[PDB]
Design a binder for this molecule. Structure first.
Ligand SMILES: CC(=O)N[C@@H]1[C@@H](O)[C@H](O)[C@@H](CO)O[C@H]1O
Ligand SMILES: CC(=O)N[C@@H]1[C@@H](O)[C@H](O)[C@@H](CO)O[C@H]1O
Ligand SMILES: CC(=O)N[C@@H]1[C@@H](O)[C@H](O)[C@@H](CO)O[C@H]1O
Ligand SMILES: *[C@@H]1O[C@H](CO)[C@@H](O)[C@H](O)[C@H]1NC(C)=O
Ligand SMILES: *[C@@H]1O[C@H](CO)[C@@H](O)[C@H](O)[C@H]1NC(C)=O
Ligand SMILES: *[C@@H]1O[C@H](CO)[C@@H](O)[C@H](O)[C@H]1NC(C)=O
Ligand SMILES: *[C@@H]1O[C@H](CO)[C@@H](O)[C@H](O)[C@H]1NC(C)=O
Ligand SMILES: [Ca+2]
Ligand SMILES: [Ca+2]
Ligand SMILES: [Ca+2]
Ligand SMILES: [Ca+2]
Ligand SMILES: [Mn+2]
Ligand SMILES: [Mn+2]
Ligand SMILES: [Mn+2]
Ligand SMILES: [Mn+2]
Lengths: 234, 236, 236, 236
């Protein structure tokens, strides 16, 4: 059998196997609101309570993993900020000091420091050159490796209020990370793949989860994840 | 636990849990060659199904199954182009290759009509789109969702890479009747995706057989249709 | 992921992924009656196998598969006693019921000899031990590990409960060649257990079929042999 | 898919997904020594829990989880006998070792009373049954189902084999409130089994932590309490 495999068809208020950081919490309707819904600036992260071994220093083996989740980003106006992200970080990592919504509570700055040890898949809704000079000129899906400045991005045809199903696979033998996104409501689909060597970026033990932010209360939007499936294997 | 879940990291010559139809077989190197590779090359049609039928929906409870499958395949053409393509499909339990089928129909259809009695849902990786022989195809190599007809209900440009390995993930989420096809080439990062709505209960019978099919209609424009591995899960 | 994993929470009449041999069938209430239950009772023999063969060992790598299975069954006798029993088994791929088989051999054997050509490993839940007719059996109802012969290599007293549901877990751990049979009756806490060493590579071919078999040799001492659910996993 | 499923074929020193309490740790040879092993032996108590809490039941839907776990352990005594035993348990999420606990209570209890506030269900493999210090134990080494008390609700003779590896399978079937403990020694075929009815919803909180605990109350009668591997699955 595989090393780890967990599935959440729904979340429950004060779920003991999820570590809530910042404003992240789960509503009475069973959805994980990584960003606070009320109105105000917000940053939040939710991690699975147990660390995962992404690679072994003894055998040299690297883990292959696959995850699936459905999320909704509902903006009041036609646009919102800032985005949501799925990430892998050092075991029991805390939100960095001086982090901002535009960095999804994953980074202290816009530099590419190898000490960050973070790999994330962002669903970036804000790309304003005023605050995020590193972003391309459209809403996007990006593969982030130790920096908020994605190594590869793709146009994200975001649909306001609609549910998006995402499948992310990492195949160790080919160092391939593929992000599969689709909207069952209208058939809109976006995809992106990049090469990433986990052994080169992350430590042996990591924590997986979601993070997100709202930098401007005036351009509010939700960052709700409805369900989450995850498997890893060395 | 889920109803069914199988995984083949590699295939073995004369694998007893795979039903070989036509020219399909597995080489000594452990790959499933749905299409014959011989040199001297030749016209070919082949299909490989998992030996056990799967219940895709229940008439008693009304439930429909959700499924997910993953496979890696290679299509290596001698020249810069080849024919005809490969397909992943769901058909009536223990379905045989139709009479008078052709490579361009991947051994799944007797004709180009859209008959509801075909009871076939397939995801095609079409390499040949010549109007002279395949008038129903768009003007480029494509990935298509086929429902009871070789004339896809939805297609998308397929950025095929000669000889490179492609990883595919196909998911079917019953509650939303959503079929998503995720394709990527780890070698250069090329990715193609397509999704469509399909009600399995409306198209297929309760019991189906799943597998791969493919064809080579013109030996002069030969190409391989090899699947390297295969993972599959279904649940009611 | 594991090579194979299937689960049946219930069965459906004319289930396409189960091969029915003899009198085996599934009732409208969703239970697998390996033995016939009819108005005027009668002699019966039946077997039900999963439709797809399983690779229990590989001759290329030398690897042997570990497997685990779980099922719940009921044996309801009219009088206080019944015949003949039920068995879970592994046999050559797509094996048929042998000619001249009898209920006391659960449709698995042609005779009482220990022929290596039988290639059968089975776990029997033997209800009939009549010395004159089944001279090989011990003096009580039992659970037995059968290897190429109806004369078990190891048995244990089976505290059978008429009409009660029994939950069984059978595990085979390849690295230690250990086969463990875990049986329990949730209704009163009765539990029976037995383990034995068996080298699958030495007994069975690479490809096998798994399933249940059972029999009723004397219609006068009728009893049912119903399996309610079935879970199975194997991995090389 | 199931709610949770994890598997450890071996352990690694300072494993981040296991919470070590007391003297529990993992050696360089990859084994979980819940009890301390050292040149000069000593009194010891230790517990190891999976780092993430598990939802054993939901107060919203009323659903209760079914779970299954499998592990192999070794208890090697210097002399012919040893103390005190090992236990697999479910306790309140992130539970700590109680104050004034002793080896004979496996670091699970503060006393021998049956307090409902303990909220502990455990399966013990008790090696010490001395009436002077463990008056609640039967007159032999045993496997016991403990519910809120070190005085088991049901026990069974445990045919312990010094230094030999034991394979254990524990299943909890929610619909029948049945807890079955299956133990076997692949080396000689020795097998012990025990079943009991336990309503998890009545005993434990919604969120629990699972793991192993053990103790050595008298260094003079030292023995190891090593777990070699561990598989676990739960589902609501
Ligand atoms: C200090 C701060 O909050 N900066 C945020 C920035 O991270 C975000 O990208 C931007 C757009 O919403 O809004 C700003 O207020
Ligand atoms: C009857 C027949 O074989 N027709 C095939 C057709 O299926 C295929 O699309 C085409 C291109 O290879 O070649 C034709 O010969
Ligand atoms: C030839 C034949 O049918 N022999 C059966 C025997 O297999 C069974 O063990 C016994 C008890 O029911 O009844 C006999 O009639
Ligand atoms: C960025 O985060 C790291 C970790 O919290 C911290 O050490 C560093 O000082 C932060 N930068 C600033 C300006 O606080
Ligand atoms: C097409 O295939 C079906 C199934 O084998 C067959 O009945 C039919 O006669 C074939 N030919 C035509 C022209 O439909
Ligand atoms: C036993 O079964 C085998 C296989 O069907 C058969 O070859 C053999 O002749 C049978 N024995 C008898 C006495 O019929
Ligand atoms: C026994 O353990 C409980 C739980 O930690 C604790 O509250 C109690 O005070 C302990 N009893 C004694 C005498 O310390
Ligand atoms: Ca941004
Ligand atoms: Ca074509
Ligand atoms: Ca008998
Ligand atoms: Ca004791
Ligand atoms: Mn960005
Ligand atoms: Mn086409
Ligand atoms: Mn017998
Ligand atoms: Mn005890």
């Amino acid at each position: 059998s595989d090393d780890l495999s967990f599935n959440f068809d729904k979340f429950v208020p004060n779920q003991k196997n999820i570590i809530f950081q910042g404003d992240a919490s789960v509503s009475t309707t069973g959805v994980l609101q990584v960003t606070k819904v009320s109105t105000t600036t917000s940053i939040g992260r939710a991690l699975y309570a147990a660390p995962i071994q992404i690679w072994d220093s003894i055998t040299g083996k690297v883990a292959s993993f696959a995850t699936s989740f459905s999320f909704v980003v509902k903006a009041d106006k036609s646009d919102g900020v800032d985005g949501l992200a799925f990430f892998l970080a050092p075991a029991n990592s805390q939100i960095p000091s001086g982090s901002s919504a535009g960095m999804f509570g994953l980074f202290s700055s816009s530099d590419s420091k190898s000490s960050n040890q973070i790999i994330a898949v962002e669903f970036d809704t804000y790309f304003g050159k005023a605050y995020n000079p590193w972003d391309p000129d459209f809403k996007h899906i990006g593969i982030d490796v130790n920096s908020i400045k994605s190594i590869k991005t793709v146009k994200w045809d975001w649909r306001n209020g609609e549910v998006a199903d995402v499948v992310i696979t990492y195949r160790a033998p080919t160092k391939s990370l593929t992000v599969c996104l689709s909207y069952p409501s209208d058939g809109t689909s976006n995809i992106i793949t990049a090469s990433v060597d986990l052994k080169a970026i992350l430590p042996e033990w990591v924590s997986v989860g979601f993070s997100g932010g709202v930098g401007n209360a005036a351009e509010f939007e939700t960052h709700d994840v409805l369900s989450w499936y995850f498997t890893s294997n060395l």
